[PDB]
Design a protein around this ligand. Structure first.
Ligand SMILES: [Ca+2]
Ligand SMILES: [Ca+2]
Ligand SMILES: [Cl-]
Length: 669
DNA sequence: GTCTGCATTCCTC
DNA sequence: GAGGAATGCAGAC
């Protein structure tokens, strides 16, 4: 037998990897249960002809925010031991168990939409940081999902990322020698018959079969070279789709990208470099100090990198002396030693970012700008970072005494200090009338950070966490309603709500966290064989019962009522393809109920339950508690009314399964 | 309060 | 109009 571990942000992310495996593996025997209170497992017996295989996958829901926050040891430490110095967490880490220790097989991130603008690079720090470790990084994204006007659920025009973002994965793979890729899955809202923007999309770009093939070959310790080349080719076809749909005058053409991909030229030595310049756009309200004159100096010498208006460009070594002279004259830099450092004979990448909002809080999208530059040009390129947004007094003080202390506590400063050779600030200081100018020679510090790794040590996460919390409530709720209780229907979660009626599945995508009167439920369960009408049970999970907010029960029902007011995003016949939603659903065709789930170690009296029902308005309370000897989840269902009591009686009678080991549970009533 | 994930409006060319 | 610049809320701590 071989054992694998799936460490994920939550149970749903863990299960998404299992769905990928099960899509290609047709198992002869499947068993589910728990290895510990926190860790569910799936055991499979399958064959490749005459060759049988016995695999077990142990799931670890919820990552630590330090070394012993939830789990006894942090699986993420294996990434920082190989150079992942940014505070970045993928969605899933798959490991192999061998000689009492875990070995990382791959890191996987799931995205529900191909994001555009600066949202495309907001989390590029993950791909950069994990990518430099040698462990494969797979970024899976749905192509396409529409952005909505939340007041009427009407679709906004499709937006696509700059071709440089999908390209950055390919160039980071070439620079590091590791497998870093962007893979695309067909979204339910991919409807080329209705949207002209998708006229030239190549459907061979979709990678569902190839991702499952890759994962299974990795689990089998087989050669993945050819599967990796097919996936890299699809990532390149996406760059081609995007670059052929943008204007050539201020952006790289596909022939330019192709000449970099095939190794004819480097991104900084393209013969056509300079046909467009680097022209940073700065809002007039963001201007202060000498920022406008610095931007004029950059535009006097720069050559464009991928796009004229991306926040970075190049100053070729042939123009670096004159660029440095103009900067030094503008800011009165006279120190001979400093000027010599600035005038090193090499190409210079200039990145300009506001960095901070009017109160001094950091810009999230700016965190991925230097990682994007490093993925495109290499982390060893010389980078000059210019910042012009407002700094709080505490920030400028740390810059003047210990910049690494500031990098340690803030993710944006960590990005800047790890990847910049020179940091130039021309910033307003909150509470003061005029700007501060700083020129930081960060070369030595950058070099040391690029060699930093955490303590070398083997890891085998203990399946018993420090204590049981919200992640554990969700794992327990999900397992009972997905594998034990008979209802087939997909139900709902944060990524969308599916409702099955007749022989059709109706789905609402792009769910907002809240509506005018509703709150998005953590789980939605559909039960069809209890009443004449289908039952929709909306559940909110919390660590403790007092965490259940006032009117949360009423808010869960109102959220479902909000979705019923609109035509579902998509629909399909369960027997037959996804189409855009055509018919509206009817709320009276369903019974709606709400539930609050939490952990309680027998601290609630009859009066406490009466008060929780009054505060929340829930129809059902699900009190969960672990028993340690022997390990069991003890479940207490408290119905507020007769409809909820019928549901409880149904759950109790149907608490049987051929796949799931129900012996790990005890349903009090 | 600070940090980070999420995602929508604003503004330049 | 295209698309990058710029922005704040929320949850956990
Ligand atoms: Ca065989
Ligand atoms: Ca919850
Ligand atoms: Cl194409």
């Amino acid at each position: 037998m071989n054992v694998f571990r799936i460490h994920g942000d939550n149970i749903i992310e863990c299960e998404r990897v299992i769905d990928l495996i099960l899509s290609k593996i047709n198992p002869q025997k499947v068993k589910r249960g728990f290895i510990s209170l926190s860790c569910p497992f799936i055991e499979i017996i399958f064959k490749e002809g005459h060759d049988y295989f016995h695999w077990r996958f142990d799931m670890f829901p919820g990552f630590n925010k330090n070394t012993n926050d939830r789990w006894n040891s942090n699986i993420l430490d294996l990434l920082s031991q190989k150079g992942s110095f940014l505070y970045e967490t993928p969605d899933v880490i798959i490991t192999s168990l061998n000689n009492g220790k875990e070995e990382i097989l791959m890191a996987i991130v799931f995205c529900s939409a191909l994001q555009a603008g600066n949202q495309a690079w907001q989390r590029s720090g993950r791909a950069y940081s994990v990518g430099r470790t040698g462990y494969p990084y797979i970024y899976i994204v749905d192509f396409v999902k529409y952005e909505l006007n939340n007041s009427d659920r009407s679709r906004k025009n499709l937006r696509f990322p700059n071709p440089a973002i999908p390209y950055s994965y390919i160039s980071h793979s070439k620079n590091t020698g590791n497998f870093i890729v962007q893979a695309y899955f067909r979204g339910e809202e991919y409807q080329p018959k209705y949207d002209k923007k998708l006229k030239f999309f190549d459907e061979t770009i979709f990678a569902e079969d190839d991702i499952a093939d890759y994962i299974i070959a990795k689990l089998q310790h087989r050669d993945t070279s050819n599967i990796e080349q097919l996936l890299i080719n699809k990532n390149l076809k996406m760059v081609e789709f995007l670059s052929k749909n943008t204007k050539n005058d201020n952006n790289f053409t596909y022939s330019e990208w192709e000449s970099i991909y095939n190794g004819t030229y480097r991104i900084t030595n393209l013969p056509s470099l300079g046909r467009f310049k680097f022209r940073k756009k700065i809002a007039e309200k963001s201007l202060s100090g000498k920022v406008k004159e610095f931007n004029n100096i950059v535009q006097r010498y720069s050559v464009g990198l991928a796009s004229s208006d991306l926040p970075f460009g190049v100053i070729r070594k042939e123009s670096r002396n004159d660029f440095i002279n103009d900067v030094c004259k503008l800011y009165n830099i006279n120190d001979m030693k400093i000027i010599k450092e600035l005038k090193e004979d090499a190409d210079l990448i200039v990145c300009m970012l506001k960095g901070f909002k009017p109160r001094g809080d950091d810009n999230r999208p700016d965190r991925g700008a230097l990682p994007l530059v490093a993925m495109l040009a290499g982390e060893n390129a010389q980078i000059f970072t210019f910042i012009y947004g407002p700094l709080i007094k505490g920030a400028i003080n740390l810059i003047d005494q210990d910049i690494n202390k500031l990098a340690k506590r803030n993710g944006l400063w960590k990005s800047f200090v790890s990847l910049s050779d020179f940091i130039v600030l021309d910033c307003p200081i909150i509470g003061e009338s005029y700007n501060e100018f700083r020129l930081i020679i960060n070369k030595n510090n950058k070099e040391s950070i690029l060699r930093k790794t955490s303590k070398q040590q083997n890891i085998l996460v203990d399946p018993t966490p420090n204590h049981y919390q919200e992640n554990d409530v969700d794992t327990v709720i999900y397992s009972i309603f997905k594998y034990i209780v008979p209802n087939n229907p997909p139900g709902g979660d944060w990524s969308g709500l599916s409702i099955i009626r007749n022989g059709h599945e109706f789905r609402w995508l792009s769910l907002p966290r809240v509506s005018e009167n509703g709150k998005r439920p953590d789980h939605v369960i559909q039960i069809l064989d209890l009443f004449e009408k289908p039952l929709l049970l909306s559940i909110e999970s919390k660590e403790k019962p007092n965490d259940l907010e006032p009117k949360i029960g009423v808010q869960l029902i109102k959220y479902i009522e909000y979705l019923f007011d609109f035509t579902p995003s998509v629909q399909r016949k369960i027997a037959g393809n996804w189409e855009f939603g055509n018919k509206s659903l009817v709320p009276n065709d369903f019974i709606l109920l709400s539930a609050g789930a939490f952990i309680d170690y027998d601290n609630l009296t009859e009066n406490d339950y009466e008060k929780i029902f009054e505060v929340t308005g829930c129809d059902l309370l699900i009190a969960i508690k672990n028993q340690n000897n022997p390990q069991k989840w003890v479940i207490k269902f408290k119905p507020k009314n007769t409809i909820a009591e019928k549901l409880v009686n149904y759950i109790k009678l149907n608490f049987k399964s051929n796949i799931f080991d129900t012996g790990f549970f005890h349903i009090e009533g």
